[PDB]
TrEMBL record, chains A, B, C, D, E, F:
One of its GO terms (biological process) is detoxification of nitrogen compound. Residues 6-268 form the CN hydrolase domain. The lineage of its organism: Bacteria, Bacillati, Bacillota, Bacilli, Bacillales. InterPro entries: C-N_Hydrolase, C-N_Hydrolase_sf, Nitrilase/CN_hydratase_CS, Nitrilases_CHs. Belongs to the carbon-nitrogen hydrolase superfamily. Nitrilase family. It comes from Bacillus pumilus. One of its GO terms (molecular function) is nitrilase activity. The active site is at 46 (proton acceptor). CDD domains: nitrilases_CHs. Pfam families: CN_hydrolase. PANTHER family: CN HYDROLASE DOMAIN-CONTAINING PROTEIN (PTHR46044:SF1), NITRILASE (PTHR46044). It comes from the Bacteria. This is Cyanide dihydratase.
Amino acid sequence: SIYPKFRAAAVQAAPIYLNLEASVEKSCELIDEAASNGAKLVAFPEAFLPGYPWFAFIGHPEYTRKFYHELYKNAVEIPSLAIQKISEAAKRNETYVCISCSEKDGGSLYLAQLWFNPNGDLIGKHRKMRASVAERLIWGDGSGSMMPVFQTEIGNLGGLMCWEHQVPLDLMAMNAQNEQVHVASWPGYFDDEISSRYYAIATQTFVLMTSSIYTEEMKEMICLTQEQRDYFETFKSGHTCIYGPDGEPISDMVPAETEGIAYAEIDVERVIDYKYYIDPAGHYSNQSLSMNFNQQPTPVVKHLNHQKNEVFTYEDI
Amino acid sequence: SIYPKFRAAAVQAAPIYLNLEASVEKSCELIDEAASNGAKLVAFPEAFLPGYPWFAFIGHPEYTRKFYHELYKNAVEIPSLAIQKISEAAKRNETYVCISCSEKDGGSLYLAQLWFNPNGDLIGKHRKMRASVAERLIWGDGSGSMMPVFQTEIGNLGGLMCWEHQVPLDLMAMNAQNEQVHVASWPGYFDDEISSRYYAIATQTFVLMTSSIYTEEMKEMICLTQEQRDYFETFKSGHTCIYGPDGEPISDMVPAETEGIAYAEIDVERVIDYKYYIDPAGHYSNQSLSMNFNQQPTPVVKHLNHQKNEVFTYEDI
Amino acid sequence: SIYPKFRAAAVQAAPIYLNLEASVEKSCELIDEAASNGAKLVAFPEAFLPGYPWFAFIGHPEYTRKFYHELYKNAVEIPSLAIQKISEAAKRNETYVCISCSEKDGGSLYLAQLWFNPNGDLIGKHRKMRASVAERLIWGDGSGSMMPVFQTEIGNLGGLMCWEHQVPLDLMAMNAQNEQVHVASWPGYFDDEISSRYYAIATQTFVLMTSSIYTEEMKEMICLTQEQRDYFETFKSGHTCIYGPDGEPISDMVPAETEGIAYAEIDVERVIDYKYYIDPAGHYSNQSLSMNFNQQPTPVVKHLNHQKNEVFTYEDI
Amino acid sequence: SIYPKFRAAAVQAAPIYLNLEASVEKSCELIDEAASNGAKLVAFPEAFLPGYPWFAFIGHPEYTRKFYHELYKNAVEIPSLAIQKISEAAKRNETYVCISCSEKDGGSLYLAQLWFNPNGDLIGKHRKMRASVAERLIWGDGSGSMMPVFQTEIGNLGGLMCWEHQVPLDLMAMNAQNEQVHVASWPGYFDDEISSRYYAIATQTFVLMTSSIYTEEMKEMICLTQEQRDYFETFKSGHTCIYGPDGEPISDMVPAETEGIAYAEIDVERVIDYKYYIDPAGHYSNQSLSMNFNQQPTPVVKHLNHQKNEVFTYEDI
Amino acid sequence: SIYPKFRAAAVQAAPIYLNLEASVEKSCELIDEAASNGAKLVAFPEAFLPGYPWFAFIGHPEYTRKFYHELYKNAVEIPSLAIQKISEAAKRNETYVCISCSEKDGGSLYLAQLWFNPNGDLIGKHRKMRASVAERLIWGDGSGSMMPVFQTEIGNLGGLMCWEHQVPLDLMAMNAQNEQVHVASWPGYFDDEISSRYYAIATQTFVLMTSSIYTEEMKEMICLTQEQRDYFETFKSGHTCIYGPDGEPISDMVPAETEGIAYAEIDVERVIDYKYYIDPAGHYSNQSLSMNFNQQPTPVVKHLNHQKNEVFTYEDI
Amino acid sequence: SIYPKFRAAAVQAAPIYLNLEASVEKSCELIDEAASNGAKLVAFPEAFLPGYPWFAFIGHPEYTRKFYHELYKNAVEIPSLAIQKISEAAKRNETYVCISCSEKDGGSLYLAQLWFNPNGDLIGKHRKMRASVAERLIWGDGSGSMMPVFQTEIGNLGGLMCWEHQVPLDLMAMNAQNEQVHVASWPGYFDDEISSRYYAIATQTFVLMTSSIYTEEMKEMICLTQEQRDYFETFKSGHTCIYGPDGEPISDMVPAETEGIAYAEIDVERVIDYKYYIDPAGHYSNQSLSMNFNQQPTPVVKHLNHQKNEVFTYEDI
């Protein structure tokens, strides 16, 4: 492999809440402004299209139905306009774009992460394994089949999200495929400091820690009563940083709950020095511990060579 | 996709028994009536064109062979006068139509239902799976590739009949699609409110429960002995009404033994609220059970590369 | 489709052995005799123009060569004078006609069945699919693209011949076309009652057993040594009669050696009774078994865009 | 290959109606007497355990239910006492045995054949490819994985039931496996002669044609009113004869309405003299016609990685 | 098979809320009184032993964390005093009993059923497949190994609970194992008349259905504020009935919002009258659709054989 | 087996230090000289691609990390140009060739040995079971699943290296597979002659032993302080020889200071004489001692069936 040298970037921003066309044009403007500095890769926070669902934490399980209706009409799907508008924005700038969204296929709704290559093509996508405490009331289940890492011009890319960092099985599964540069997206409320820093030491990779901020445009409609509004203000902000495989930050930190961007040099040839001490999927292991990994698509229904039907035109009849 | 709002009609009616040439004219009169009131979709009961074969229940296996002539000589085929005459009736009024019939192809006889679109073209057809209990003497076996749902101006459409609601396999196979509005048809004898109501709860859809009524045109011709006549009067009559995805009527109920139509406005946007609780082909599944759904058309004999033939005309000879 | 009623005739006769110009006029006298009684269809026995090659299996393979030389100068061709004298005989009586020929094409030789319409034009032809042990060194091979069934004023016509009735794949192919009336011609020696009677049950048609008689001139031609002559007398003689779809005769039986004609009423509306019990191409089938029926013509060499040529007339030069 | 020269026997008898425990014992005195005369192979008629359902052909689709209730408790339920009572009678005599019966799986009935050899174990099993005319409402359906041809000390072995001799593709499927000695069995109402002799000629094999009789003790059970009794008892009985590959009987005829047995010498080397003329799957083939044969076992629900359970008990207590 | 007769009992009750010892003591009293009346099978309502978590959906997701701390200390581990107290109450009366509870398992918590034999031994567990919208915060998810059906002197026994009746794949998985007598438990908030009556028809079984009632003491614990204390009055309440294999109720319904029991005589050979019409996994199947069922146990960590340990005693040190 | 006779060659050489392309082209030239004399097998010393890591012995473990970064970028990936050049060199000469190198799969390095057969293909691979005193800093352990011997045109072949001769369990395991001709590579420093010779007496195989030599290329970069510079010259020189089953040499010596090549006749038929006295895997043992040899392939993570993933091209999007 090449061991390339380049500079990457991580964006701290908020979407226009539950309003998809305003969100996708703001996303397009952020790519066109981030790539102007010559950064080769750009990353975004959790659930950025159309927005992370705070209403599940504030109300009892009947309250969500009043807003789930308004979310479900604004979700992404694969043959849509939102995908084409992001593909134009990558093609115009020649940068790897990594972006998060709610997606609909069949009747259910899922949380996903999408990767666009500099030729404008969609490389592949990742699904969250299992939902955290509140969001089980909204999003569907994951799968073990679609958990990729991609060989690229900029080394082996991959990514995870939220509390996926809390379970060791997915750390080993990802590390077994030789990931080298890694993106981690957080919503903002969870304590994102330590579990992010630890993943760098455990697997020797540069971590682009990425997290969102609150705005009045959500909280002035997320809540219907005084108890719910002041209770919302008990939540907290989150940082964004680039960490080295040693566990210290390379970048500055984006300050004080305000929209912005952070970037640094990535010199991936340096990763070799820290694989001298540990390699969990290699020499630093044991003969009495193993793992069973399955990579097969098992949807509920598996079509077998579906074909189109015959139509009798009104002229024939 | 898109979520329209419109009003739809279902009819309780009886055909001119075994006499196709009068029966198709009564069908055109019911379309030109039901569309007068502004309904966008219309649906008919089971086996409506020649009529359902009650003679299979009243006598032993030798008795039906006498009546089978009158049936076989009055079944429709594609194309015919029946198809072009119903296509005129849909083209004049700009409404979707679902109509059920006995269709003849090869030497065999089958049961189907046909879908006509507002441009007058025939969208496709569906053929019954397994042929119940008495019908096994009269009608041929189904096929698995002919199980469509249609994407339309009025959402996603499809339908089923008789005991097809008693088998979980076809219910799950249909809900593997994304069906939203549904037509179910019954002959008068089977007990039908429970299975149609359960289907609406399990696969969140508006169901147009539709069924037929008996007449002296049957009674004075279909039987000969006193005990055949006495036995035939023991059968009960049916119902017609339309249900929400909550399992409750939105229409009124048509009276229990009279010809007439029922209608209501339907607002397919509302399905999302009940999609919140369960989704059997989505997030409510478990990765220990799956399904195989083969869609390859396999007729008994498959022609390859159909070709015509030449003749030596008597002027050339 | 439509279900006519009509009178049909089958002929027991012999040609003037290996002479074509006598045998075509014998057929004209015999068809004007058959059609004088008002029969609407007439069918002749196997290889009637100019005769069946009994010499092919009385002697060893070298004995055949000297007789083959005299057969080859007496075969028919598509534009031959032998066709005009039959086409006029059909035109002058307005009946369907079925006749058997040996055809010469491209210097090779084949066995064929050949059909004429009441307007005098040639409807189409059929070629023997495979030769039996007497035939394999006289006549050429079949083709799959030459297996027609004709829609007509008198219902769906077709007809195999000879040993073809022992091969189930041809029964299925012919039944897939939905035939209704089926000619079946035999030379005379092969045992022919039981296979033609099974065919009537298997595809539910009327069938016309048609076969030839031995004569004095053909044995004086073909024998030479005494142990050829008294060996030829080993062969059994044939018979002709017509069967219903139930498997009993409807006609009388023609006496078992003399020249003659049999005829009966045919009432094709009656076929529907027996399609109730069984239909191999319809309901009486299994999804675990199929058949590939290629139907394109593949001559050994294929001309593309056939065109003529120019000549420099002597006046020009 | 082997050409074993032996003796085989056809049995006609009636089982006492709808009583498994009596019919099982009655089969033992027949097998022991037939084997005491030196026959190596023995065959039995239709559904001999417990009995063929004549009540399907008389009265309404409701009138049969009160009898179906009694049939269900008398099905064979493999493995059972009814299997081991037959298996020992093979082991004690060293004869091959074919017998046919109602097999029960889960909730459902199938009609099947069971094959046993001199070591007393099952060679294999067979099931119908479709029902007939009346019993189509009683029995279920087989699959292509349950149509074997065996090979053993008496040559190759197989068999078919009822109208399976009248479907062209089943003749073709069996002939692909190099058939030699064939069992065929009939309920006595249908016409066995024509259906069987053609199969002998089309396969070039000895056919062990076998048939049932109906005893006076049926009349007092199956018909409850005078006209039903006077519509019954107006049927054929069939012939239980043995046919050689030429289509001529090789044994005496059994008297038309009694218990009895027929047997003859079988000399398998004789078939070679006839396979010289024609072979439907060998040298008599053509490139334009084929057949797709699929025999993947297809249960509706298939278990994989079957596991066993345990009961907890008083160890702790 | 055997087809027995017995008396079955269905109980309507309420547990002492979140207090296991008080709830265990009530169950021994109720089993002895039900068994004293001659019933041989006794069912129980949903989550009965510690009580169902109503607090899970009156409050937002940080209100419930206060009460989870009480439920965790009141769950049943296997084995326990709670099991010992039930097991002897079965042995003292020789009644089969079914009961439902939160099974504590390692650090995790699952909803489950237990079945006891008349000898007091444990027949087997069952685990909830997927949690419904109110309860996805509390319990973990089961797997396809822990879904048994088992054979016993009452006939075949099995069970399902809550929303599991609303998805088609579980209906087919249970029906594939030849079902006969079925039990259903409901929490009493969900409308269950339709889902239970359709299941009775769709598998043809006696279905025995049960539910719990609220008790006024719950409203002193579950709701700590006025609007919650009023809102929690607006819920539905549940039924208790025994339904025959066609949807008619056999017993009276339990007549009041009180503790009580329903009784009926059950006679399993009645089911055969209805298995005649349809059998979803038997003869009513089709080839085009199937189902894959996997029964391999799948614990997250599959620890193999484990050994004991040796400790050095104080005397030897 | 066949007991062949042939010439074998043993090579003493040093690589161009740490330059992989210079080492593989030097190796490619050295085969083309060694094969020019007609020897059929050629074997190289330990770690010839790219070189043995002497720096691990000269300094403390934080000095090693400075050089590890350059060794890692020059390790042999498979497949690569380093494999294609050696495969060409075997294909051009039709001699078996045996070579050893630092392979790199996943994140770790391993020392390995590779065998190329005369058709140019790899017949197999071996990994060093256990690392040596300083060498434990650099490479991972092997596995029991990779310990081949090959059946060949030149008898049964295998191989071992370095301290693997000191442990008797690997002597016994290698002897259990009936090896006949053996290669034993060494780095150069370890005391080798007596430990190598004992393998010949214990296993009765022809043994080829081969060692590397020191150069100025390493001396002027492995160290820089005088304290290291003159310490490194302490290490002993190596030897290259070949031995028979007698424990006594058949080759000449290669001079101890220089590169060179050694030859002899090998006559495998001569092994069965010495195998008269002792062989520990055969008759010369007793049942009171045994060995357990498990050879399952157990990597740390085991991929199951895995394929590719779907990609959407920029024109389609």
